[PDB]
Amino acid sequence: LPSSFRWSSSGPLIGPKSDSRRIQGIKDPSVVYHDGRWHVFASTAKTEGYNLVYISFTDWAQAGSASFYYLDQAPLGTGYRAAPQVFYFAPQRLWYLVYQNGNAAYSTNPDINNPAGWTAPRTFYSGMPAIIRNNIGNGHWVDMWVICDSSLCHLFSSDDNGHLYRSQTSLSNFPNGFNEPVIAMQDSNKNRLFEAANVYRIDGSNEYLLLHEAIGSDGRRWFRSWTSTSIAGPWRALADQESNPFARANNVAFTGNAWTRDISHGELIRSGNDQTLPISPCNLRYLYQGLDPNSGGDYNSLPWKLGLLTQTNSACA
């Protein structure tokens, strides 16, 4: 894995359907390739609220025409749900879908191909942990992310106030037993460490990759990156500056026209679908949300669409 990045971006691939839901943004994607298809979970966003959608397609050229399965039709149900993470928890032979509902929440499903099967929400904690209540400011508890190694499971989350939190539990007790979070990383400037963590095992190394969204000096979204030998840190900067970013307008080429100046809440294409959240260090691809740089108005109404970054300074195949 290199210490600087360059990318080529697609155009917008996935946006809202034109249906009575009048969804304004498709956001916060999670993605796995399984049995010959892409499986994308995303937030639906509008002024009125958030819920989740499942999208599947064989080929990236067909992503835009893929049908939506609105997950409020499953037991997962209506109400607020946002920012999903899908993975297969191999010891239980169950897929998990992690998201926020005001708490840190999850659904399960034995079959990712059955969107109707996602369970009604359960939570990882009984309420907002004290350390998060104490430090959240007037932020929001968001962007729940699980990664496990051979003995522990970790649950990361953000507060939109410059703190990244981490709880852990044993692999055998998951999803129960998550302890009081510690502050895994923090910045006194919330914009430098804002939301939307990703944490991955880097295949072929004894290292982990942390990505985290920031709001830059130009007001635009971008990603910083760090690595560590442990999921518990300490984290060392990889590409974490505006002049050496993980992903930002200044290291993203477009084959077509530049349709976004923001590189926001995304996920890397993984090398496997299990609870270890592995990536290959080769040919990185980042499924992300962007929007027209002339967009304004209320945050929840912004016209976010999903695109795909393909690494152009790849170290390998």
Indicate the residue among 294 and 299 with the shorter CB distance to Ca ion: 299
Q: Between β-strands 7-9 and 252-254, what pairing exists: parallel, antiparallel or unpaired?
A: parallel
Site size with Ca ion, rule: CB under 5 A: 1
Indicate the residue among 28 and 159 with the shorter CB distance to Ca ion: 28
Q: 252 to each of 5, 8, 31, 124, how far by Cα in Å? A: 9, 6, 21, 36
Provide the token pair at 222: 């971008």
Indicate the residue among 34 and 244 with the shorter CB distance to Ca ion: 34
Indicate the residue among 155 and 172 with the shorter CB distance to Ca ion: 155
Q: Which stretch binds Ca ion (CB under 5 A): 22-30, 66-74, 214-222, 241-249?
A: 22-30
Render the burial of 13-44: b for 16+ CB within 10 Å, e for the rest.
Answer: bbbbeeeebebbbbbbbbbbeeeeebbbbbbb
Indicate the residue among 106 and 150 with the shorter CB distance to Ca ion: 106
Minimum CB separation from Ca ion for residue 82, in Å? 9
Task: Determine whether the annotation assigns residue 154 to a binding site.
Answer: no
- For the segment 90-129, give every residue that binds Ca ion (CB under 5 A): none
Q: Where do the DSSP E strands lie in 141-202?
A: 142-148, 152-158, 163-170, 182-186, 195-202
Minimum CB separation from Ca ion for residue 145, in Å? 7
Provide the 3-class DSSP secondary structure of residue 186.
Answer: strand
- For the segment 177-216, give every residue that binds Ca ion (CB under 5 A): none
Q: Which stretch binds Ca ion (CB under 5 A): 6-14, 20-28, 37-45, 176-184?
A: 20-28
Q: Phi, psi at residue 306, to the nearest 5°? A: -95, 135
Minimum CB separation from Ca ion for residue 211, in Å? 10
Minimum CB separation from Ca ion for residue 286, in Å? 12
Q: Which stretch binds Ca ion (CB under 5 A): 21-29, 90-98, 205-213, 248-256?
A: 21-29
Element (H, E) at 288: strand 285-290
Is-contact 125 103, C-beta < 8 A?
yes
Minimum CB separation from Ca ion for residue 309, in Å? 15
Q: Which stretch binds Ca ion (CB under 5 A): 27-35, 39-47, 244-252, 300-308?
A: 27-35
Is-contact 82 52, C-beta < 8 A?
yes
Give just the sign of the alpha carbon dihedral 252, 256, 262, 267.
negative
Q: Which stretch binds Ca ion (CB under 5 A): 26-34, 50-58, 123-131, 236-244?
A: 26-34
Minimum CB separation from Ca ion for residue 98, in Å? 9
What are the beta bridge partners of residue 264?
A: 289
Q: Between β-strands 122-123 and 236-237, what pairing exists: parallel, antiparallel or unpaired?
A: unpaired
Q: Give CA–CA dist 265/253, Å, rounded.
A: 18
Indicate the residue among 28 and 240 with the shorter CB distance to Ca ion: 28
Indicate the residue among 278 and 314 with the shorter CB distance to Ca ion: 278
Annotated binding site: 265
Annotated binding site for Ca(2+): 265
| Site for Ca ion, rule CB under 5 A | 28
